[PDB]
């Protein structure tokens, strides 16, 4: 006849509690496990994997494979802008459906730096140079090559190799950032300008393309798990 007292919080069903429970089938012997290859152990072994970014939406290149091709042609004037998009890896309509996006859309607070691998999938005799700049927020978007080379930037050269990994650093006042579209914690902008024109020999196409990947560095993290706003349902299947 031990004396006990029932504290508030009894006879409730918390959705995310961890308690023991009586077994339904006792002495069930499960089948022994097998060393199946490819064992994930933390969802941050998926943010490390590159995935192409649909950065050419344009409302008609979306329902096709053209959304991933970035137009790069032999310009006449120097210092033109190739692309540009704000960096909100959970709210932007570009980094949303990438492999990083559907991992971020389950959490709310993230951190760490992001890499951006580019790959010149053009001809074999063509060269050129591009300026990948990342301007932290506070002002507007940069509008002239003279403006964007003030921020953080790499001057990419195309040669034997076919890539250059602009890693956006983690420059923010707070230890985290929201994944929803906010204004208090903006994360800047990403641009990419012609350093020098795209020159080609004769009998070679002047319309080349570029693909762009995205991933996380080795200091990424998330927090405050929630559910995704993408998948709806009205009745059962």
């Amino acid at each position: 006849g031990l004396p006990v007292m029932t504290t508030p919080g009894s006879t409730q069903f918390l959705t995310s509690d961890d308690f023991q429970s009586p077994s339904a089938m006792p002495q069930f012997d499960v089948t022994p496990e097998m060393q199946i290859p490819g064992r994930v152990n933390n969802l941050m072994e998926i943010a490390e994997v590159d995935s192409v970014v649909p950065v050419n939406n344009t409302e008609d290149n979306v329902s096709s494979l053209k959304a991933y091709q970035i137009p790069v042609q032999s310009n006449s004037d120097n210092g033109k802008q190739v692309f540009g998009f704000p960096l909100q890896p959970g709210a932007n309509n570009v980094l949303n459906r990438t492999l990083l996006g559907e991992i971020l859309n389950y959490y709310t607070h993230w951190s760490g730096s992001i890499k951006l691998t580019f790959m010149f999938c053009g001809s074999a005799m063509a060269t050129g140079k591009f300026l990948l700049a990342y301007s932290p927020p506070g002002a507007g978007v940069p509008k002239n090559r003279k403006d964007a080379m003030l921020g953080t930037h790499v001057i990419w050269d195309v040669g034997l190799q076919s890539s250059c990994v602009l890693c956006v650093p983690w420059i923010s006042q707070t230890h985290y950032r929201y994944v929803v579209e906010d204004e208090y914690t903006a994360a800047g902008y990403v641009t990419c300008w012609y350093q020098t024109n795209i020159v080609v020999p004769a009998d070679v196409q002047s319309s080349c393309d570029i693909l762009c990947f995205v991933s996380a560095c080795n200091d990424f993290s998330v927090r405050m798990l929630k559910d995704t706003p993408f998948i709806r349902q009205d009745t059962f299947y």
Binding site: T15, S16, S21, S23, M25, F28, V30, T31, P32, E33, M34, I36, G38, R39, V40, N41, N42, L43, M44, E45, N56, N57, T58, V62, S63, A67, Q81, F83, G84, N93, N96, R97, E102, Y106, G112, K115, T117, M119, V154, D157, G159, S162, S163, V165, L166, C167, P169, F213, S215, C217, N218, D219, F220, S221, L225, D227, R232, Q233, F236, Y237
Partner: protein
């Protein structure tokens, strides 16, 4: 502790070791850290990747299916085959992997609702529900007033209102070494019939019914079932489902663009 790695200081170099240029053809993702393309300060990092693990991502209960059954009617009772394909907020969390292995923790949230009775001075005592679990192959009841309910050695649970919701635990019940959330290939050696159907994940049915009788006025009830995958291990990750589900059996869909669109490539 699962701490993330800190960042080490750097100095402005001028050498032949280029970390930036690499070859993405090799299927080998880059491995650079910001300390290799700019000047950084030695920042101790205390962030932790604990709340992103597998058991912190999956071990959270989620409604699966819910049925209703009236009291004052013949064969008023609910059946349900056990499968996670039906609700979509949980189906998508289980498609991120191909071969899962977990034991379960059910939970039933049973409610009642008084129906439009017709007599005068209706008053009913507390109710008692039974939730019978039939393994795949056992005998199934046909009506409420049947003798497969009591005289049985299947696992069932008796619960009455006004108390905590019932809960039982189910171990890893399968024929293989992992549940398969995908299975490409037919189920008949002649390659006919249904396409993506597998015996590996079957778990039986669930029969529920009232225990009281019809006093004076019908009572429709409702039961909600909640999963909780514990001890989970995942294998062979998979991209997340994009197109909207349409059926519970196969993976049919209608094609839809990759992302929502913007006005111009530079905005």
């Amino acid at each position: 502790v699962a701490r993330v790695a800190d960042t080490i200081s750097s100095r402005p170099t001028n050498s032949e070791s280029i970390p930036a240029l690499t070859a993405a053809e090799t299927g080998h993702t880059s491995q650079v850290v910001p300390s290799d393309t700019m000047q950084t300060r030695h920042v101790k990092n205390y962030h932790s990747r604990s709340e992103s693990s597998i058991e912190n991502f999956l071990c959270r209960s989620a409604c699966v299916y819910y049925a209703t059954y009236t009291n004052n009617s013949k064969k008023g009772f609910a059946e349900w085959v056990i499968n996670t394909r039906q609700v979509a907020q949980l189906r998508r969390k289980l498609e991120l992997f191909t071969y899962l292995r977990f034991d379960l923790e059910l939970t039933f949230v049973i409610t009642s609702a008084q129906q439009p009775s017709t007599a005068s001075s209706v008053d009913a005592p507390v109710q008692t529900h039974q939730i019978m679990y039939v393994p795949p192959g056992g005998p199934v009841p046909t009506k409420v007033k049947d003798y497969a309910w009591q005289t049985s050695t299947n696992p069932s649970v008796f619960w009455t209102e006004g108390n905590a919701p019932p809960r039982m635990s189910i171990p890893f019940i399968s024929i293989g070494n992992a549940y398969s959330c995908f299975y490409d290939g037919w189920t008949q050696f002649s390659r006919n019939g249904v396409y993506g159907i597998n015996t590996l994940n079957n778990m039986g049915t669930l029969y529920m019914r009232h225990v009281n009788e019809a006093g004076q006025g019908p009572i429709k009830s409702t039961v909600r079932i909640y999963f909780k995958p514990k001890h989970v291990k995942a294998w062979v990750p998979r991209p997340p489902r994009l197109c909207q589900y349409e059926k519970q059996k196969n993976v049919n869909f209608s094609p839809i663009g990759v992302t929502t669109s913007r006005t111009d490539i530079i905005t």
